Write a protein that binds this ligand. Sequence first.
Ligand SMILES: [Fe+3]
Ligand SMILES: [Os+3]
Length: 649
Amino acid sequence: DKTVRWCAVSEHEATKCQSFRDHMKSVIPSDGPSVACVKKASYLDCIRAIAANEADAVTLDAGLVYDAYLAPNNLKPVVAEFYGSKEDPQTFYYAVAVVKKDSGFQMNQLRGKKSCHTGLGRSAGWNIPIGLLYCDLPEPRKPLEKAVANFFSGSCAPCADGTDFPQLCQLCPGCGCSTLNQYFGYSGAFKCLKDGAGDVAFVKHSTIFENLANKADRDQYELLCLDNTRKPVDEYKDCHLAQVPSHTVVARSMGGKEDLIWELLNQAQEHFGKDKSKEFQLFSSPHGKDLLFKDSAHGFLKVPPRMDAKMYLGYEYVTAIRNLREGTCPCKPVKWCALSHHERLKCDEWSVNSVGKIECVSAETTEDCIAKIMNGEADAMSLDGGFVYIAGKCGLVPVLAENYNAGYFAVAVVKKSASDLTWDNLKGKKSCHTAVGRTAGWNIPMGLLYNKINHCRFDEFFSEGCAPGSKKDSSLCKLCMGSGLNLCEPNNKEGYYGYTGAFRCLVEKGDVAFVKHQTVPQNTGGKNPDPWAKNLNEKDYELLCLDGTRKPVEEYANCHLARAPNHAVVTRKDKEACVHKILRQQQHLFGSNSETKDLLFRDDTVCLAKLHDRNTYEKYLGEEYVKAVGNLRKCSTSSLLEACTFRRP
Ligand SMILES: [Fe+3]
Ligand SMILES: [Os+3]
């Protein structure tokens, strides 16, 4: 059977599910998914039932998405409720800290200020801000209300115990837990800031726009960013305390059945969703509110498969709730992320010489390591600019750049004997790329190509090629040399992968190789001893100019495709200042004074350079680079980038 066992937490919910089950039987053919209805006492009990393989799916608020993820449950987000509109689905809200313009303080100066909360126990108004501020609170932090009352000088915290902690109700005497209190709820907390009672209101990003219709009034307000800067109120996506998903269907991380859950729910919304007007309605029910799904929901979005719960909830949210759950409070060592056994070994002996200031964690791919930097399992790694773009879109920032000598040169290599080849038309030729998504092998050359053909189907433009990372059936995998499952892989087990791998591809099979200005000189004239390169001379290879002319290999200064952004080390914003300092000290000791090749850092690198204002992927890579990659992701297959685009489109 293809049965999805839905888990209900009430008798009203069990009745709706049973109607859900019966109406779907009349719309789904017998080969399709069917509903079973399991009834438990609580959301916690449904989470355990799903982990125990007694049910398959339940819909949770963000806090319970966190609980469902913790061992031994290990549930995973799989389907999202969206709200608003099909054109602009709203899946998340943003908990923000609004302040009045020019009040003169930052997020790390909240102690002693006057605070306005929507209500004790609520997400944006209490659990997230107090979760983030937890270790800032005075000891003993238990009971929490007493610690908060001795952190803010006065507050309006609706539903707090004002009898025992009267500071919490200075701005709303009694801490009235209903609309009879003018500072209660989401507008109440913002009104507590507007009327001048408090200095800061902890609310949702939309409260400001629903209580202040005209932008002129809104310009008198700002938001507190976690980097201790302020931003305007409509920049909440770059300046919030946490991004919170409203209502998430969860499932077992292994054993699913994600596939079945989505095709059940997606069919259900197409026949019984909003505006479908049948006798059964998925997002309503005659008896009781919000049964199985929120009554305000407008449909379902499939959660991208790369995403786990920590990535879905976000780093900020997870920190806040873990602080409240665990209550644990201490620059600490920088945990580098390695991609190989050989790369891990280099880090290991680096860690032991750094006397603890460096630690090592491992992952199988670059994307896995990036996800570990995002969620805190890892801290830093050095990335090609193409991965810096991905790391940036996923919330990470560049901190230092590898300097090889303004960065390296992306050039197009051809064989000198091929007199006909020109940059103006290489259509129908055989291409060799370092990998899809990398700076010199893909983003620079194919970005320029996109401008003169205006599409991303480069396997239909070149006859064939080796572009490691392309889909195994593609014209651009046919020239690759990996065997078995390694054919066309963007790793070492594919011999045409990388700067020199793409040059070898040109030497043996291809017509053009997109690499960097030093690749040909380092792999010719006997410098590379491998049989494929040993007997090559660099005078038999030329560079393709943008002109349409050609020049010798070491004339790259005036025959390049573009200047490339250097590889850079990326990190979280909260670890930027510290990663900057530890790495500056460690290269003073182990710098200019790899067992295999280019492990952790490229071997051309001389120093790790500071970046000044170019501390953002948009400012580090440049407007031209980012616009070109935006053009190319119309054909990108990056699962990590898909997960990060789902949270920040
Ligand atoms: Fe590169
Ligand atoms: Os009833």
